[PDB]
Amino acid sequence: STDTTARFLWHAEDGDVLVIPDTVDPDFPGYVADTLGIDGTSVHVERTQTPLSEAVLQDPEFIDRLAAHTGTGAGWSLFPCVSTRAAAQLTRKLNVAALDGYEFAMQNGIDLLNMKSTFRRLAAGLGTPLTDGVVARGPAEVRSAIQELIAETGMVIAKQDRSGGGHGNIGISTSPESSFPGTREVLAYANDQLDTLADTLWSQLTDTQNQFITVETYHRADQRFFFEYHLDGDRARFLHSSILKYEQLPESAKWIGLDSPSRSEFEATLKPAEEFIEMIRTIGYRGYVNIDGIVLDDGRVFFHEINARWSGGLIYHTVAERLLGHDYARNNFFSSILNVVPAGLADLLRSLERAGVRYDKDSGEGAVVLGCNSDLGPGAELLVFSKDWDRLTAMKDEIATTAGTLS
Amino acid sequence: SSTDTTARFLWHAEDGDVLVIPDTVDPDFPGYVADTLGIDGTSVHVERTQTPLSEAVLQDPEFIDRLAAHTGTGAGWSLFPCVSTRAAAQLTRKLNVAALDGYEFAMQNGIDLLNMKSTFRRLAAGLGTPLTDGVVARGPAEVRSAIQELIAETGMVIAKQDRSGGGHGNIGISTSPESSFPGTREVLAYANDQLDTLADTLWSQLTDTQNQFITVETYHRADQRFFFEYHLDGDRARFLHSSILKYEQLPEGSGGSAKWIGLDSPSRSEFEATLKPAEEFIEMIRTIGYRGYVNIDGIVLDDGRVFFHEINARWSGGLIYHTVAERLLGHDYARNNFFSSILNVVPAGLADLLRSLERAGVRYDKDSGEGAVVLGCNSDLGPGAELLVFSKDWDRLTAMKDEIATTAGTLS
Ligand SMILES: Nc1ncnc2c1ncn2[C@@H]1O[C@H](COP(=O)(O)OP(=O)(O)NP(=O)(O)O)[C@@H](O)[C@H]1O
Ligand SMILES: Nc1ncnc2c1ncn2[C@@H]1O[C@H](COP(=O)(O)OP(=O)(O)NP(=O)(O)O)[C@@H](O)[C@H]1O
Ligand SMILES: Nc1ncnc2c1ncn2[C@@H]1O[C@H](COP(=O)(O)O)[C@@H](O)[C@H]1O
Numbered sequence: 088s089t090d091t092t093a094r095f096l097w098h099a100e101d102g103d104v105l106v107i108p109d110t111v112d113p114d115f116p117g118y119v120a121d122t123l124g125i126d127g128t129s130v131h132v133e134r135t136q137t138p139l140s141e142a143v144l145q146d147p148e149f150i151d152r153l154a155a156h157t158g159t160g161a162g163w164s165l166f167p168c169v170s171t172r173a174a175a176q177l178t179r180k181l182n183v184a185a186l187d188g189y190e191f192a193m194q195n196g197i198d199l200l201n202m203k204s205t206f207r208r209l210a211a212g213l214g215t216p217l218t219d220g221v222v223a224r225g226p227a228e229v230r231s232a233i234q235e236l237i238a239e240t241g242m243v244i245a246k247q248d249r250s251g252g253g254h255g256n257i258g259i260s261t262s263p264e265s266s267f268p269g270t271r272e273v274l275a276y277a278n279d280q281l282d283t284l285a286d287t288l289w290s291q292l293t294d295t296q297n298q299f300i301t302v303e304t305y306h307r308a309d310q311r312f313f314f315e316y317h318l319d320g321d322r323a324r325f326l327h328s329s330i331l332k333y334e335q336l337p338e339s340a341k342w343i344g345l346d347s348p349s350r351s352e353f354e355a356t357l358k359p360a361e362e363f364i365e366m367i368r369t370i371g372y373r374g375y376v377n378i379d380g381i382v383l384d385d386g387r388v389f390f391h392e393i394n395a396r397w398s399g400g401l402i403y404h405t406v407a408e409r410l411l412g413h414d415y416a417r418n419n420f421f422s423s424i425l426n427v428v429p430a431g432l433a434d435l436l437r438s439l440e441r442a443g444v445r446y447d448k449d450s451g452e453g454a455v456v457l458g459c460n461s462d463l464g465p466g467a468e469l470l471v472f473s474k475d476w477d478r479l480t481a482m483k484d485e486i487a488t489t490a491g492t493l494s
Numbered sequence: 495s496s497t498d499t500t501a502r503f504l505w506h507a508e509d510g511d512v513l514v515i516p517d518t519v520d521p522d523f524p525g526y527v528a529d530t531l532g533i534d535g536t537s538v539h540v541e542r543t544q545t546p547l548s549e550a551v552l553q554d555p556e557f558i559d560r561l562a563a564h565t566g567t568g569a570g571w572s573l574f575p576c577v578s579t580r581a582a583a584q585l586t587r588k589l590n591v592a593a594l595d596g597y598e599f600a601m602q603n604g605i606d607l608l609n610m611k612s613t614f615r616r617l618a619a620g621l622g623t624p625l626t627d628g629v630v631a632r633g634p635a636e637v638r639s640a641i642q643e644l645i646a647e648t649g650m651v652i653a654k655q656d657r658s659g660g661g662h663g664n665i666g667i668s669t670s671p672e673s674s675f676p677g678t679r680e681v682l683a684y685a686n687d688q689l690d691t692l693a694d695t696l697w698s699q700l701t702d703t704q705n706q707f708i709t710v711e712t713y714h715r716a717d718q719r720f721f722f723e724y725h726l727d728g729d730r731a732r733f734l735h736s737s738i739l740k741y742e743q744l745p746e747g748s749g750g751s752a753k754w755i756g757l758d759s760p761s762r763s764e765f766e767a768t769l770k771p772a773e774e775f776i777e778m779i780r781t782i783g784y785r786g787y788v789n790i791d792g793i794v795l796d797d798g799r800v801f802f803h804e805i806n807a808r809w810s811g812g813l814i815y816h817t818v819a820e821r822l823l824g825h826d827y828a829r830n831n832f833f834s835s836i837l838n839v840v841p842a843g844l845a846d847l848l849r850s851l852e853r854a855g856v857r858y859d860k861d862s863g864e865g866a867v868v869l870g871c872n873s874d875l876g877p878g879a880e881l882l883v884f885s886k887d888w889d890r891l892t893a894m895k896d897e898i899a900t901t902a903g904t905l906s
Pocket of ligand 2: 654662663739804806
């Protein structure tokens, strides 16, 4: 059915392999490879019918599947989303390019990072800015932390320690007309019931491996942004910045898309995030990492986490650079729609044509398909380009009109 | 009415200080220390708590008030905590005492993220710090394949609790009895046909709710078992001392574990391959932001290889040794001096213990800066009473030691 993984096909060059647990719209590779201007027939897709997990990566059936392509391993490398211990061993076993930071990974190092607990710890000691927070160690400590952090704003967040996308986050409100981007539920504050309120907070966001909870002052932000980086033994190249776009608030806020150069890239954001990033470079992580953060109306800057993995808009950025150019951000803007009424790639391309906004190499304007049927923003996932923000906004509203969204 | 293991830290005391102990001090022991030290004894007080120094007590309103009574308005005062927990940092605030350096780091129990064995394997492996082959084991099957792969090189694997200390969480695995395992509690023979339950025996006993990691490593025989202690501030990571870790000598018996019995300081393990890597590792943890005392353990191989085992963001053991050394012989004491502790003297009343040294001819002579001093009269630090011996000469100091063992007996 779904093709939420097909999107990573845009990372592809001649000779490459993609691995998906999903399906591909039969047309989606040729289309992607025609757009990317590469030899479709020189590009492979190896499907599993079960999720892409550690067990798979260790599984030699799985392993020899890849060894068919890599054969000797010479001139082959692995391009993992999460530089896991199995992923390193997979480079070991295939005789493939050694993973960078191999040893950090072999000690499951990339899993200390990708904890919200580790983040605050690291950012307190370093001085990187943080909302007032507590790394909760149990329901008792969860109860106190809300009794204090509720007061500045009337708003508080509770994050499961290992999690992504805003999925392990519950908010705490003193006002039903407060909206919480990056939460799942939102529960109302209640002085007379907080022992019970931290209970439901404990049981829902802790398990056997995760016994730390974070609880922060939630702040209403004027800019919800993040920065994605690439790391090696020499440097951390700043890759890009984007905007976490939310909605579901009419008078809780679900994620809906990403937007191109963030309107948030000054020193007070770049410099503290860059310093933190390098310290992580120092402790060993080799690869892509991104740092979430906000900017407030008054001006205070805050950071939430690093995820040592593909930001999830890395694909957006790759696409832009492969279509528009290394420096694309200077004169271009991209933006992403989800919940587009899904359909065949053919039926998708026609509405984009019927709307007048299909990607068009001449202008550098228009939209491309990253999935006809995905779960991430359940719908078809599009990416749209424009030298002009206002044009981009019209083009999207057309794709609404012509192709159809779901509410 | 029991152990005085806490009483050793009276030797940090200066004028007007307060030491907090859950313990029992020989009622003569304070005055002996201040005396030997030269402090105004009636200035230093000792506040006995009837419970361990738990986070709840640091937060106990009566405990803090009883601390306020001495701290006054905080002005002049600082906290001198072994472990900069969160409750520690919060104490300095409600007593108006000077802020704990690294406050925010502490406020996030950073200290606790450090101090995990798994953490150390991770950071060092990322940094480059020499490690022994090993694995952060997420479960018992992992433990199985680790013991299976890691047993060969030396025939000895070690297995440790993620958050523990004093060699209490380390379980040895041996393919031969006649294995000496410094830094472990028990040693188990590795059979092939019982590597199954081996692995789940270790898993079940070295984990709990809050710990789902077990460290598994190649255990090496070693020319020297050392560590280096540092002090940390915003400006500099500060080298304090190096020290030799002394473990029990087993009569080549089918027992494996060698208990820890003492500490020799001006160590013979300070060169390029131990210092500089350790240096690099310690600076980064200053980058991440720990503030205070920390130490890094390590071994040097018969063939000259080096490996580091862990850091502890807290007082090492030998910090009181080093301290007292500084206070009695001076800052740059390691140039011309040596010291060595003892853990297993027959415990005794202070007067008697002081008789023995005199009888042995080695009670610390202020005039010559030579001889021994009591650190506790009945401590459970390993064995029993703890003493610390000084000399400008290595052989003389040893000769003083067995004099003491002859004179005051030992619990071996
Ligand atoms: N776990 C511990 N065991 C024993 N003593 C401890 C422990 N943790 C802290 N202490 C003692 O607690 C005291 C902390 O010092 P504190 O109570 O703040 O006043 P002070 O520093 O001694 N006096 P001053 O700094 O000169 O004004 C020191 O005596 C430490 O030795
Ligand atoms: N893999 C190993 N190979 C060889 N010797 C080891 C190994 N691991 C530990 N040791 C030795 O055993 C001791 C055990 O201490 P360690 O492994 O650092 O944990 P620990 O008990 O927490 N140390 P500490 O808290 O300072 O008492 C070390 O000081 C070394 O002497
Ligand atoms: N833990 C994971 N989370 C998300 N995607 C994953 C994960 N593991 C594997 N994948 C998929 O497998 C590829 C990268 O593998 P990995 O490095 O294990 O994330 C991408 O196609 C991902 O969609």
